Amino acid sequence: SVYAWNRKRISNCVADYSVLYNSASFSTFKCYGVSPTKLNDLCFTNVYA
């Protein structure tokens, strides 16, 4: 729900943002601090969804 949004932690994985980037099933794909296509080289830790 709006007031009870659900949280997930992601760590110790391998991520492929390119396939979802190419996916058109998402209405808005708006990335703020980084370029959406530049996600396959730089990587981070403690991903929060």
């Binding site: 601090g33 980084v34 370029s35 296509t37 530049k38 080289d41 730089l42």
Partner: protein, 49 residues
């Protein structure tokens, strides 16, 4: 025996050293940018923004 009897030359050297030091230190200022390193913002962004 007496120390600091040569204050003028020491002052000149100190002035030069601190000028160079602060010039070096200026490299770590955002100046309004999201970061102070060229490579990282290049690698995380795209060549339009």
């Amino acid at each position: 025996s007496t120390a600091s009897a040569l204050g003028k030359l020491q002052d000149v050297v100190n002035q030069n050293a601190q000028a160079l030091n602060t010039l070096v230190k200026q490299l770590s200022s955002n100046f309004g940018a999201i970061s102070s390193v060229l490579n990282d913002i290049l690698s995380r962004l795209d060549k339009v923004e």
